[PDB]
Amino acid sequence: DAWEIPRESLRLEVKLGQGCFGEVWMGTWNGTTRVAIKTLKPGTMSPEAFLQEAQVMKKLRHEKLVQLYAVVSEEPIYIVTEYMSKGSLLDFLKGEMGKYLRLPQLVDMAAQIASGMAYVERMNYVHRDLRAANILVGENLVCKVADFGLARLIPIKWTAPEAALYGRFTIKSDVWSFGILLTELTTKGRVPYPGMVNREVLDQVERGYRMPCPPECPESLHDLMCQCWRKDPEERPTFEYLQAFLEDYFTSTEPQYQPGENL
């Protein structure tokens, strides 16, 4: 790969996370470009298994997908990507900033993530783990889809039933997850299905249960969520449709919107 860079060119500065996969750092590339750097522990995971997230990232390029910059392919492995200054969308919604986010910023964020996924749709990829913990936020409220560790070319509260039960993962099961993501945005990052354990969630959703309209969220936005949660996967809307609806929301759908205490 022309993706390869020399080890001298990477300076790992501040640690940002741990795991069984390894760890993630903020750093510099070529002493100029700020970057996110992902480490594998040479022992714990397969080298080929860790490198697969990068393999898929080489083919995909879009302004709302976190961009690969470089790799170090030999053990110890490093994966260099663009640095997203504000952490995961989940931490952003739950944190100091969440207090001031109102519906117009939240729906814009939704529109951006929809655009990223529309690209994934057009390329015939599936993400399979779309949720606020796997979206990253940059300067100026930019949201980008991250973490294609599971993403192929054909977490039960975020997973569509047909996927969780029978392994049928498609772009339409991603659309379900997007519905769940809309509730994370509109509740400031609260865990979906509050007070329900996982075993209870599978049961309920199979029997037709769906989350109610979150406090102060317009019913038209809840109705979009319910479209993303249709039992029949092929009756769920496309990411191209969702992008456009969200982009146009405040003119076409909710032109009379007024600010409230939380949304």
Ligand SMILES: Nc1ncnc2c1cnn2CC1CCNCC1
């Ligand atoms: N590209 C990135 N920029 C900034 N932080 C990052 C990344 C990639 N991963 N991380 C670490 C976050 C830290 C918050 N929890 C989700 C993972």
